Amino acid sequence: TGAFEDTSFLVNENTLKAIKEMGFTNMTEIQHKSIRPLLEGRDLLAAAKTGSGKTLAFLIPAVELIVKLRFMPRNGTGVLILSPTRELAMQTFGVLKELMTHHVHTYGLIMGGSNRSAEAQKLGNGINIIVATPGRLLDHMQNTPGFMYKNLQCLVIDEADRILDVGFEEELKQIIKLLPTRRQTMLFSATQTRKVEDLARISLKKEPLYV
Ligand SMILES: [Mg+2]
Ligand SMILES: [Mg+2]
């Protein structure tokens, strides 16, 4: 039973209600493979491509941790999603926007070269789930002082191979280092590369692999 409605206990009803209003009925392969285990709290290494429905795969358990632990603007940041490009960062964010329609928790797109000071003032408020792009996020983490990440629960790395290709290998190593180690970490990459396997060691602990 790969339907979405059988994910009620495991995932908040307000999440399923939104997803039902998105027009989805049944889970894709990676969703079925990934969600159940990710809810339990395992670190995933996924060999996924765009079109697999991987976005929802990582978003459902991400929003779940934020709702479960009842995060507030007070609590700083909870989930951190990394995207190579602005196109994908925005893409993922639009989905997040749809999924958060029946939630009160704070979410924002702290990505791309676009008005740095307005983002800083925004993050100061307390943004629970953040869809971001690496190079700019590190800039906030090193320079924006009122940015709280100490409470981080989930870290998602979308299109890992594509992140390295745009030249963010060092930007990655430096965000991960500065992140609290007690966390769930998810790694999605279409192409299994030598470099990809290396930052997987840095990011993950003992992953359930999914192809
Ligand atoms: Mg660079
Ligand atoms: Mg991928």
Residue numbers in the entry: 171 to 179, 185 to 386
Paper's wording?
Both domains contribute to the binding site for RNA substrates and both contribute to ATP hydrolysis. We used X-ray crystallography to determine the structures of the DEAD-domains of DDX2A, DDX2B, DDX5, DDX10, DDX18, DDX20, DDX47, DDX52, and DDX53, as well as the helicase domains of DDX25 and DDX41.
DDX18 (Myc-regulated DEAD-box protein, or MrDP;) is a nucleolar protein that is specifically upregulated in highly proliferating cells.
